[PDB]
Design a protein around this ligand. Structure first.
Ligand code: NCD
Ligand code: DOR
Ligand code: ZN
Ligand code: ZN
Ligand code: ZN
Ligand code: ZN
Lengths: 343, 335
């Protein structure tokens, strides 16, 4: 059976949650990835240096003995965040980046951003100091169709922001459209993107035809096939400012399979082999290592890992579920036979 | 305070299921509607007169004393169905119409002799109008059906009476509006009240997941304008399609809204919002009978504009049933 050896990868977009759930999910990441960008959308969010320090330690506490894993912390951008607090966290190595979630005029100032214009002092500071901005690029106005929200963000927010702050480094997280693929392809060295395995492997038909499948329900929402194909083409092209970001985003089974299912795929356990499957199908395995292990480091100005891992092209069954203290997690591709697994 | 008195309505598109489910759900229809078109997608489907007769009696068995409700039975069209069986059931007063589900039927070409018979005898054809090829995006399946199946069919069988069931697009709305007297449509409450955002923003809501899939807002608006205009070949058809809670709320949720308990008031709210209450009775109680060549009901009911809370769930023998709009407050109630 065929082997693919790559420099140890990193995950440039990860949700690890907290408490018991954190304890359950960390190992799926730490066994494989050297570093991950740990997102700050805890309840309450990580908006201070002290919280990020404490959260980093809880994550390290949960890493199994012998895994060489380093969490890269982020600050949740809010209206009330002091730019001095963000700067101090960056300067002390606590915050690797800051994350901007969709604006909403009714958000509490302690929990989010009302408008992008309103946090310009903090954004100017990030530009000044060279701190990268990670963007969940959707506009969430009630009158905008959910499938249009990413495209609308490019026009309304992304392009004006980058024109306003010409030195700002930005990762367009988990892109899902041809709109975003083209935009990123056509950008400068200060614009990059991450892509999840689900947005490469599936489109909205997989989530809605024959049944509604809440384990494929995630934001930004799966788009039509033309968008899926654009994403696949982009990673297959060798374009070097797209990189691995799983957006592994675990929710208990009962919170997924409910009257109002939570958004997010728990894909940490199966992401890497899923990406290998996509690059192989695209006859583009020569660009697979760079996607997983080189492009992200280069954009963040961090070293490439100097250890290796091996994927083997031998069929394996994915677990149907993974136990939590209470309830269970259903992994991405649960119960399926997958083509590539880690040796 | 405000009271609205209408001729008793009918439901021209209903799923009653079978067994204990049927027992549970029939009363929500029989208490209000004089008649309903009972769809034939049982497992196995109703494809013979004999099965239709038996099913009709199970339905009648489950109707509470004092409800004057008549189920109008339908035949599930199959590639192989004998035209003589379908005609016999029509002639015996058993089959009111036949229903075309897309593969269901593999092609309209395979069932031509059945369709030609329906045309000759005056039997309406009820169409679930979606193409199903795996590669066609789910949101495009209705519009694609119009071009590739509906319009060719109608041009070939010019005398055939067709109801375009549960339409969900401006495409279909425009098509029906511009059609002749042999084409009509039903519209559900969900496709008037909501669009796909309501199913997908803030969470995935499987109780709003149904086929044809909820579409974007411009399509919702087209349907609302269609009913509100007074156009007289669109009529009430709930597509009440109940599934146990944990078949809805699962890793692969079933399609269908259990809307029988709340549909009528929900429609009232829509027409009221569209400033079109003067057309509400015809949609509910006149347009269908006229298309089907059946008399209008000779009794009347009243809706009052008093806010009722919808039950969170309805008990079944096993599991529960979550009604459409569960836990929400509805603006109009049946007095
Ligand atoms: N529409 C649905 O979502 N469900 C209906 C089938 C139908 O009307 O196609 C059902 O029978 O469950
Ligand atoms: O933006 C997001 C948030 C994430 C989560 O659950 O944290 N889940 C998602 O599906 N995408
Ligand atoms: Zn996000
Ligand atoms: Zn995320
Ligand atoms: Zn249907
Ligand atoms: Zn139906």
């Amino acid at each position: 059976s065929q082997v693919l050896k790559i420099r140890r990868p990193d995950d440039w977009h990860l949700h690890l949650r907290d408490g018991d759930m954190l304890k359950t999910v960390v190992p799926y990441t730490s066994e494989i990835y050297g570093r991950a960008i740990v997102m700050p959308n805890l309840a309450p969010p990580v908006t201070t240096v002290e919280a990020a320090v404490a959260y980093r330690q809880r994550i390290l506490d949960a890493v199994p003995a012998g895994h060489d894993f380093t969490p890269l912390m982020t600050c949740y951008l809010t209206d009330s965040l002091d730019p001095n607090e963000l700067e101090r966290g960056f300067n002390e190595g606590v915050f690797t980046a800051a994350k901007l979630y969709p604006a909403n005029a009714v958000t509490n100032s302690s929990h989010g951003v009302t408008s992008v214009d309103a946090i310009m002092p903090v954004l100017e500071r990030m530009e000044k100091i060279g701190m990268p901005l990670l963007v969940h690029g959707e506009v969430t106005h009630a009158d905008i169709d959910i499938f249009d929200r990413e495209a609308r963000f490019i026009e309304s927010v992304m392009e004006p922001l980058r024109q306003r702050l010409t030195a700002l480094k930005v990762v367009f997280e988990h892109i899902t459209t041809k709109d975003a693929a083209d935009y990123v392809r056509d950008g400068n060295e200060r614009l990059a993107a991450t892509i999840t395995p689900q947005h490469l492997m599936f489109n909205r038909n997989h989530m809605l035809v024959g049944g509604v499948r809440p384990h494929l329900y995630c934001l930004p929402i799966l788009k039509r096939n033309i968008h899926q194909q654009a994403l696949r083409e982009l990673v297959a092209s060798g374009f070097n400012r797209v990189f691995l970001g799983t957006d592994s985003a675990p929710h208990a089974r009962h919170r997924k399979e409910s009257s109002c299912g939570c958004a997010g795929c728990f894909n940490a356990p199966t992401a890497l082999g899923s990406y290998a499957t996509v690059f192989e199908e695209m006859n583009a395995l020569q660009h697979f290592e760079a996607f997983c292990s080189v492009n992200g480091p280069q954009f963040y100005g961090l070293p490439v890992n100097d250890t290796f891992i091996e994927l083997v092209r031998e069929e394996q069954q994915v677990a149907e579920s993974i136990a939590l203290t209470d309830d269970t997690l259903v992994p991405f591709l649960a119960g399926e036979t997958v083509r590539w697994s880690v040796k």
